[PDB]
Amino acid sequence: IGVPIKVLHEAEGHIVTCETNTGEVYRGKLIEAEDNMNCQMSNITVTYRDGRVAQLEQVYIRGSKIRFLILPDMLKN
Amino acid sequence: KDKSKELHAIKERYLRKFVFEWDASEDTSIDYNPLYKERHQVQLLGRGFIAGIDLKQQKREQSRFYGDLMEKRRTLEEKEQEEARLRKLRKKEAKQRWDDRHWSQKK
Amino acid sequence: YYRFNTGPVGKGPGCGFWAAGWRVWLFFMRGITPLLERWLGNLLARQFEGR
Amino acid sequence: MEQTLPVTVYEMDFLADLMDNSELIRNVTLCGHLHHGKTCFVDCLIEQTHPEIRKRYDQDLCYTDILFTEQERGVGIKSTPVTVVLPDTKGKSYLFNIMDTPGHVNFSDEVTAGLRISDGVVLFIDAAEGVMLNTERLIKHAVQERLAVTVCINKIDRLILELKLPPTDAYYKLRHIVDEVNGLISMYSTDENLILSPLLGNVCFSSSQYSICFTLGSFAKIYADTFGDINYQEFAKRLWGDIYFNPKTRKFTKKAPTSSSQRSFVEFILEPLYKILAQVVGDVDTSLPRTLDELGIHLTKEELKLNIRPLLRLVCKKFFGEFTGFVDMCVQHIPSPKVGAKPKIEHTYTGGVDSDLGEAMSDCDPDGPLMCHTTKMYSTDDGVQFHAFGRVLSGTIHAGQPVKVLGENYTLEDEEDSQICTVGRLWISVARYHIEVNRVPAGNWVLIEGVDQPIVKTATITEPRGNEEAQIFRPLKFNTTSVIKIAVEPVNPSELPKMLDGLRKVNKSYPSLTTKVEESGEHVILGTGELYLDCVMHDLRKMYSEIDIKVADPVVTFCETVVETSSLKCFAETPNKKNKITMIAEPLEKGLAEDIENEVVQITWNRKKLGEFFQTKYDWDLLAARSIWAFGPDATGPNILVDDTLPSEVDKALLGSVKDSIVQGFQWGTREGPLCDELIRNVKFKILDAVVAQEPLHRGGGQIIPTARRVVYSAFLMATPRLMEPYYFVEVQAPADCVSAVYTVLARRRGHVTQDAPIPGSPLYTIKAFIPAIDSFGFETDLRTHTQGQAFSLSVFHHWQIVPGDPLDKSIVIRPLEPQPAPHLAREFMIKTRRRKGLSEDVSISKFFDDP
Amino acid sequence: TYQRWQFTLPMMSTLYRLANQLLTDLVDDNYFYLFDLKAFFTSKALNMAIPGGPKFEPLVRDINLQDEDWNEFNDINKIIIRQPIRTEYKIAFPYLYNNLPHHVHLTWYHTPNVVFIKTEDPDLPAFYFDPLINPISHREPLPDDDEEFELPEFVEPFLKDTPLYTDNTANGIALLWAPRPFNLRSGRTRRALDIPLVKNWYREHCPAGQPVKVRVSYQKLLKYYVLNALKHRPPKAQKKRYLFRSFKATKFFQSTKLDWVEVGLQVCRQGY
Numbered sequence A: 001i002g003v004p005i006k007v008l009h010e011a012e013g014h015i016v017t018c019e020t021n022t023g024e025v026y027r028g029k030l031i032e033a034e035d036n037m038n039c040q041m042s043n044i045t046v047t048y049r050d051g052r053v054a055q056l057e058q059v060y061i062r063g064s065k066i067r068f069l070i071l072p073d074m075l076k077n
Numbered sequence B: 001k002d003k004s005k006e007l008h009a010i011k012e013r014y015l016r017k018f019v020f021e022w023d024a025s026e027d028t029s030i031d032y033n034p035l036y037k038e039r040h041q042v043q044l045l046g047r048g049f050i051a052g053i054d055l056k057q058q059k060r061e062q063s064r065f066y067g068d069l070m071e072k073r074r075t076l077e078e079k080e081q082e083e084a085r086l087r088k089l090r091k092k093e094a095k096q097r098w099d100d101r102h103w104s105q106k107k
Numbered sequence C: 001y002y003r004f005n006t007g008p009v010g011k012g013p014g015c016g017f018w019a020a021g022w023r024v025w026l027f028f029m030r031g032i033t034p035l036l037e038r039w040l041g042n043l044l045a046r047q048f049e050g051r
Numbered sequence D: 001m002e003q004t005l006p007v008t009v010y011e012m013d014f015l016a017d018l019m020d021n022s023e024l025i026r027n028v029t030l031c032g033h034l035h036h037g038k039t040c041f042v043d044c045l046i047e048q049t050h051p052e053i054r055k056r057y058d059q060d061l062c063y064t065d066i067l068f069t070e071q072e073r074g075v076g077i078k079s080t081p082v083t084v085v086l087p088d089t090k091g092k093s094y095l096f097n098i099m100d101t102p103g104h105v106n107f108s109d110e111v112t113a114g115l116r117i118s119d120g121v122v123l124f125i126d127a128a129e130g131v132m133l134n135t136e137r138l139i140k141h142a143v144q145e146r147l148a149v150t151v152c153i154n155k156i157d158r159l160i161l162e163l164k165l166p167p168t169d170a171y172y173k174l175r176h177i178v179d180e181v182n183g184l185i186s187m188y189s190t191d192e193n194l195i196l197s198p199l200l201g202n203v204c205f206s207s208s209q210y211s212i213c214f215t216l217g218s219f220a221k222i223y224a225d226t227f228g229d230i231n232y233q234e235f236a237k238r239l240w241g242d243i244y245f246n247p248k249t250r251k252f253t254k255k256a257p258t259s260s261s262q263r264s265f266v267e268f269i270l271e272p273l274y275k276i277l278a279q280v281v282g283d284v285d286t287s288l289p290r291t292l293d294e295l296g297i298h299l300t301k302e303e304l305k306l307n308i309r310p311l312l313r314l315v316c317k318k319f320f321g322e323f324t325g326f327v328d329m330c331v332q333h334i335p336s337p338k339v340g341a342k343p344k345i346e347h348t349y350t351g352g353v354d355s356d357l358g359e360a361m362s363d364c365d366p367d368g369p370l371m372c373h374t375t376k377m378y379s380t381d382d383g384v385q386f387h388a389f390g391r392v393l394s395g396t397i398h399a400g401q402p403v404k405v406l407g408e409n410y411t412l413e414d415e416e417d418s419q420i421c422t423v424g425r426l427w428i429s430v431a432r433y434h435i436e437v438n439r440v441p442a443g444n445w446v447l448i449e450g451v452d453q454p455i456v457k458t459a460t461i462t463e464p465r466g467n468e469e470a471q472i473f474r475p476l477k478f479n480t481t482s483v484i485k486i487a488v489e490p491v492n493p494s495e496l497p498k499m500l501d502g503l504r505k506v507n508k509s510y511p512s513l514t515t516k517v518e519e520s521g522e523h524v525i526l527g528t529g530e531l532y533l534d535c536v537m538h539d540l541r542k543m544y545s546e547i548d549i550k551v552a553d554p555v556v557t558f559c560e561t562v563v564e565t566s567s568l569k570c571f572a573e574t575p576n577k578k579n580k581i582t583m584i585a586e587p588l589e590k591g592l593a594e595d596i597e598n599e600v601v602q603i604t605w606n607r608k609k610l611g612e613f614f615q616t617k618y619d620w621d622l623l624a625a626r627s628i629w630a631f632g633p634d635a636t637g638p639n640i641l642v643d644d645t646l647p648s649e650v651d652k653a654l655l656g657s658v659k660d661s662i663v664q665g666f667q668w669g670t671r672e673g674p675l676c677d678e679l680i681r682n683v684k685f686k687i688l689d690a691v692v693a694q695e696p697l698h699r700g701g702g703q704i705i706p707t708a709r710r711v712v713y714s715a716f717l718m719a720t721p722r723l724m725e726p727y728y729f730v731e732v733q734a735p736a737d738c739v740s741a742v743y744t745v746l747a748r749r750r751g752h753v754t755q756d757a758p759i760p761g762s763p764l765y766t767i768k769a770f771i772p773a774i775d776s777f778g779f780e781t782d783l784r785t786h787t788q789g790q791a792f793s794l795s796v797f798h799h800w801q802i803v804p805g806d807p808l809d810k811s812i813v814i815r816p817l818e819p820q821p822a823p824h825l826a827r828e829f830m831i832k833t834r835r836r837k838g839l840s841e842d843v844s845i846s847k848f849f850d851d852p
Numbered sequence E: 001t002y003q004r005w006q007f008t009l010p011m012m013s014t015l016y017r018l019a020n021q022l023l024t025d026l027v028d029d030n031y032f033y034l035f036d037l038k039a040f041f042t043s044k045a046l047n048m049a050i051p052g053g054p055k056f057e058p059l060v061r062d063i064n065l066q067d068e069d070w071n072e073f074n075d076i077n078k079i080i081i082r083q084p085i086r087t088e089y090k091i092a093f094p095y096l097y098n099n100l101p102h103h104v105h106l107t108w109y110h111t112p113n114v115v116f117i118k119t120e121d122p123d124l125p126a127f128y129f130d131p132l133i134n135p136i137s138h139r140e141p142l143p144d145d146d147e148e149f150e151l152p153e154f155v156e157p158f159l160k161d162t163p164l165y166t167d168n169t170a171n172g173i174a175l176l177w178a179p180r181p182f183n184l185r186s187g188r189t190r191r192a193l194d195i196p197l198v199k200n201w202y203r204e205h206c207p208a209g210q211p212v213k214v215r216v217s218y219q220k221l222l223k224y225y226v227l228n229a230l231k232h233r234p235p236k237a238q239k240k241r242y243l244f245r246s247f248k249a250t251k252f253f254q255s256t257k258l259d260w261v262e263v264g265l266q267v268c269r270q271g272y
Ligand SMILES: O=P(O)(O)O[C@H]1[C@@H](OP(=O)(O)O)[C@@H](OP(=O)(O)O)[C@@H](OP(=O)(O)O)[C@@H](OP(=O)(O)O)[C@H]1OP(=O)(O)O
Pocket: C001, C005, C011, C012, C013
């Protein structure tokens, strides 16, 4: 199991930002992060490629189709 | 007498020559409470023994309660095994006696 | 004695268990030694010191 | 901050960062029976998180039980809070506020104080003894306090090294313990949603001495690490509980193959543990190296030269690692406490959840009003200044920020038990070292300096200039009653002020201590038991006040009651010669006092439900059932006040005008009592008539209250009065042999053996009995010395019983220094306690009448 | 030099068995409740005698209870008497029953009972449900067997091959509770003088039904044991000078190996 993966699991319960392979940007609370980077989140703000925003209660994104995640700086220490 | 001595204890609490033998007046443990006179010496599950004292004497003078408990609780096979072990111990005891017999009971 | 003479063994002189008294007297000697050494040293000297 | 702290696995900065996120905070209380492993478990967690602090090889480091008395006696005396950051089996770190509580039954006040501010309970059960007195009492207390509960079965190595039981019978013992716990929980709780079973994760298996702790999940995780293809979650779901393994099919079944296969638990968890322990202990020099090589455990030659016990601890530590099963338990089955906030406010806060502040607190957000609640007071080693330990339910405490402190007697109308103070410094208390911080957000535990002055036992800290509709959290409700009583005086009367300061400090330190001054100028201390009072006296004489103090002989506090209805209906009139009261007294029905005390009925209820209960359960007429006025000295007291006044004789409006005054008089009379000035228990006072004057300045105030008390006293005295003795419930854990000796010792002290049974799976017996509290003095030492230390006993207050004699008998003659026979114990106890209190020599049934 | 040793567990078990007769087979200190050096220290400091314990001179000048002048506090018309407060109670709780407890020692409270089942019959398996153990009166969201959960081929219990118990398992378990030094497996070497054999004999209670002279012998032995323990002070920092090494370094002495009886006769003659 990879070092970055452990740090991801550490961010469960924190507010995180996720960009997909298609560049949609999802910000909200990370509920569950799986080993393969599958991500369950809640109370999301999504910012599309055109710039528009929306609001979602519950989402789940496949690990493969994630480009990256931004985690709190609370973890860095 | 015991009640009088008890009340006496309450009242008294509140209101050159070479001697090679300690005097009997120095004795402590001369109590009036039965709980402290007879103090229910320990029975270590019928398998622990006081140091020095003869093992056979200890077994003979023990309360026998644990022997009764063992005979009550033991299974039939457990009783058979224990009886065989006691038979082995008795054979060893008899052989030891026969070896270390006094000359008045030998040939 | 009162642990030795229990059971088949009765009162008698057959109990030899001497480590206890042996230790007692060796420990007494430990402390007596310097006193007697000093006394004999003061005695068998070229001179004598009293007072 | 920047203070000096010991080297640690985690970092204080990360701890503070976690403190802000309330979803990763777990408030847990470690409770259980005496000597069941709580302190050593906490020690081992501290060692895990602090690689420098280490437990001595042959001596056990505690890191709790810090006090000198604790270290000398070996028994924990005070609860200790520890805040740590523990990893999860998944690898995710959480913040754990663990309050380790004492196990002794006398010090249950510490446990209740910890419960008030905890959100979950971890119950430690010894694997050999099983369920015992304090375990039962603590299960009851936790379920009644509305806390989630989980269980850790400790000392499982006794089954292997002391009883050397077979794996299957050890499994049976553990299963029986689980069944006992579930039975008790069901008995004390109506809801069945709280079922304890290792399959669910509510039970863990630990051996704190040898550093072992695991759940089914963790021991499946070890298998997964060794072989990578298993889902340890499913493996854990299948391990326990009559699930036999078929190795030919590699599948588990509810049906036993071969009629000799062991359950999967025995096959996979228990048996290898047996093998590890046996190989380390018996074959350390022959095949131990091979077995450790098989396990993958490699230990250095310096290490493998250790004696058997250190070697066992080291090997088991290396094999198992961290205590991740405990963390899994707590994380899964204890609220967030964002989730657990609402029940806490529902149960504790006096203003109710429905209140606006109730909602503001049940939200539990750092950016809101300040509503700290302080339950403990910890004294600095010098013993001069105290620090308030409590939890923050809303807002954020800032160092230096002025606050408003409300004591237990504060009400939104009586705004005089409040006071503005200023908080100096804040600490995050690890057991033997305090982290100083600048602020503390809601949902955490904190030590506050500078707010000790205006509080005694419990307090609520809010903010000034706001929360004008602020009310105090309910004062702690204690698991028992402090009954034992002693008197204290200084040796040199010139040093009385020092003793007074010491008395105040001990009152603050011990939550359930009650210190008071009688009428004869005697200073009296109330405590639960002899060890409790011994510790109190030690602290008073050594820590707080440095003087020499004389202590009177122990004695208990009695109560007063009646056994039959008053011979005549009594009455009295005000000094004004108006406002005439007329009462009668009778005994209550069996169990009604228990209902009122245990809150099965509340006066706050609507009269509809109140009369419903009174009519349906205790066979009362609804007319009387809707005529209740008061419930004894407190809102929940064992004496009732009904007003039989028919509407035709007294204007009900006029009677209601002086209702409050008559209630005050009744409560004062019940609180004091005429026989010896002690509580009145189990009496029904019925107002048969009440002629009420017309004008408010002719009634009320200093007219009715004295008359009301005098009428209550006269009616009680007319009814045949009796004294009631406190009774202790004793549980002795003795060998199979000493039961007769226990019988004898108990019989010597008016005891009565209720039961005597064997402990399944152990060679010992439990003897449950009843003893009189006043005879209980020295009973435990009598037992231990008479039996040569093989029998041990713990006693606790159970119920009040009538003393055999008749108190108000002047025929009897008492000698000053003789143990009296039973038939006049009542008279002796009444007269001597009257002398102690400093009242007159004897009380006559006409003393408080208006006729004589 | 014969300074340190390290034995093996079978050796240690056999030595324990041979020494059995000198050892009391006690697995706890619950026996010594109010009968250990700390309780004796408290009783001495308070000038009281445990029934079976020693009896010293008052450490302080005893307060004569015929001296205090009947204050309001110690009035005897207020005291309810049920059981005479024995000396044992005051040693047990020195701060609740004594006025002026000075130089008093707190005593270790209870310790959990060590429920150890001594193995009488060697032939039995190490792990065996002994009759002494009270029987367990026998009497769960398990998954369904139809589920597809299958263990891999490699998987089997951690130590299947290793036997549960071996020939020397019960012996090791017993050694775990054997008294010192029989619980060790290594250490240093002491002096025959420094090893007392009956100290644990007279530290125990006197056997029941014994004569007064032996009872007083027990009491006085305990008295002197307590006195030594209390008066002990740590040794002082010497410089390690050796008398016989100095003699050997001198020229008037020489070494030889002789029979002890020969040396004894030699010393007798020289002393004469
Ligand atoms: O030395 P004591 O304790 O006084 O014992 C003396 C006697 O000793 P003496 O010959 O020095 O008077 C014997 O003891 P030993 O001589 O063997 O030391 C004898 O002991 P045994 O009968 O065991 O050989 C017996 O002691 P006891 O009666 O305790 O057995 C007796 O004591 P009495 O003076 O009471 O007769």
